[PDB]
Amino acid sequence: PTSLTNVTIFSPPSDYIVPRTLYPRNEQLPNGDLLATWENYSPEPPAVYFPIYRSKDHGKTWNEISRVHDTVNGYGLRYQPFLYSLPERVGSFKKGTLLLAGSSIPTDLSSTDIVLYASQDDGMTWDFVSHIAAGGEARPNNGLTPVWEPFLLANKGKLICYYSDQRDNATYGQTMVHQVTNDLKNWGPVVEDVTYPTYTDRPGMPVVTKLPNGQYFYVYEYGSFFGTETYSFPLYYRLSSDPENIASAPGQRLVVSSGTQPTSSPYAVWTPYGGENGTIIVSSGTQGTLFINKALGEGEWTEIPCPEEHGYTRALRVLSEDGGRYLVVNSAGVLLGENNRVSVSVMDLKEVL
């Protein structure tokens, strides 16, 4: 791999509906290949789908290889995809099964349904596996009951899906929860992970990375007034050595040594590079810079430059090559953006950390 800046993965046609693209996610397969997807706002009919683009040259070039269509509901695979190569067998699904979770939503935004698709051929073909969780109207307004934003993580022969939940609307504006499965087909009950006692609080957008000492770093945006007249979405994290037990961990506000106060739509990864504990690397949806921590989340975070533009839920990935040396930074644009595109940069962590 090499450093790359602002490589275009996909530039949408003008006749796509603003924002055209949004919500980048990616995966690196064990052979090193990179896959990228996003919310793809094509005119309907036919129903929207999640495109799957591949790079076999470490991000220099990209080609579409498949599309994940809404074969289960016919509504459209519309919001909040997530790619995940199983690192171990789960039930009848071998290590290396490639999963996509994402939300099936009709054009009228009347419902949400986080569904799970699987590919056994590295993303060439897909089959529906199960519904994870379904809810109400796909708008982020209090009183509504949607589900949103799946994040997948396997541990001990199980798959965990973390997501944002508005269904407990009598008590919370939004929470974050998870469900667990040992077979990809049958899901256990909803477990509340992050709840707050002020109704107008809206924690959201969970992303997890495992640290080398066995702790899990669970990052989220914490929407709140914090007792003022102004709402904000500062980044918070929780630390737990049990990835199914988040509720018992107190939230910790991410503090940056420069004074930047990062907000919205976090992403977190970990590399062995940078020191004896490696480095946690965090993005927000508002800042173009990155935030790093060489002490497992202790102390304050260091803001560093980044050549990739800022974007909503900008996605990070530490590539495996050279023991975690290169970082993918992948944007699909901004909310309601008039000129969104899907792009990627690669940074050399040997130099930038």
Ligand X SMILES: OC[C@@H]1O[C@@H](OC[C@@H]2O[C@@H](O)[C@H](O)[C@H]2O)[C@H](O)[C@H]1O
If binding means CB under 6 A, how many residues of this protein chain bind ligand X? 14
Contact code string over 177-206 relative to ligand X, x by CB under 6 A: ---------------------------xx-
Among 79, 162, 218, 222, binds ligand X (CB under 6 A): 79
Find the binding residues for ligand X in span 97-126 (CB under 6 A).
none
3-class secondary-structure state, position 351: helix
CB 73 within 8 Å of CB 48: no
| CA–CA separation, 210 and 294 (whole Å) | 14
Toward ligand X, which CB reaches closer, 124 or 336?
336
CB atoms within 10 A of CB 225: 12
Question: Smallest distance, Å, CB 78 to ligand X?
Answer: 8
Q: At 348, which amino acid appears?
A: D
Q: Out of 37, 80, 85, 331, which residue is the one contacting ligand X (CB under 6 A)?
A: 80
CB of 315 to ligand X, least distance (A): 13
Residue choice 1, 10, 21, 23 for contact with ligand X (CB under 6 A): 23
Return the closest-CA partner of residue 331 out of 4, 17, 38, 18.
38
Quick check: 38 binds ligand X (CB under 6 A)? no
Contact characters 128-147, ligand X, x per CB under 6 A: -----------xx-------
Closest CA to 265 of 225, 205, 209, 219: 205
Q: Could you give the C-alpha distances from 41 to 134, 239, 310, 329, 341, in angstroms and in order?
A: 21, 36, 20, 22, 12
Edge to edge, the sheet with strand 326-331 lists 4-10, 342-348, 326-331, 315-318
* Of residues 170 and 276, the one with the C-beta less far from ligand X: 170
Helix (H), strand (E) at residue 235 = strand 235-240
**Per-residue contact flags (x/-) with ligand X for residues 313 to 352, judged by CB under 6 A:** ----------------------x-----------------
Residue nearest to ligand X (CB): 204
C-alpha 282/C-alpha 316 separation (Å) is 8
Residues 218-237 that bind ligand X (CB under 6 A): none
Nearer to ligand X, 41 or 128 (CB): 41
Residue (190 or 335) nearer to ligand X, CB: 335
Whether residue 46 is preceded by a cis peptide bond, meaning omega within 30 degrees of 0, is yes
d(CA 22, CA 9): 13
For residues 184 and 334, which CB has a smaller minimum distance to ligand X in the complex?
Answer: 334
Residue with smaller CB distance to ligand X, 166 or 209: 166
**Which residue number, 177 or 352, has a Cβ lying nearer to ligand X?**
177
Torsion of CA 77, 79, 83, 86, to 10 degrees: -80
CA distances from 140 to 23, 126, 137, 166 (A): 16, 30, 8, 9
Shortest distance, position 336 Cβ to ligand X, whole Å: 7
Q: How far is the CB of 80 from ligand X (least distance, A)?
A: 5
Residue 38 or 273 having the CB closest to ligand X:
38
Interface with ligand X in residues 285-304 (CB under 6 A): none
Nearer to ligand X, 61 or 231 (CB): 231
Nearest to 202 by CA among 180, 174, 233: 174
Residues lying near ligand X in the complex (CB under 6 A) are found at: 22-23, 39, 79-80, 139-140, 148-149, 164, 174, 204-205, 335
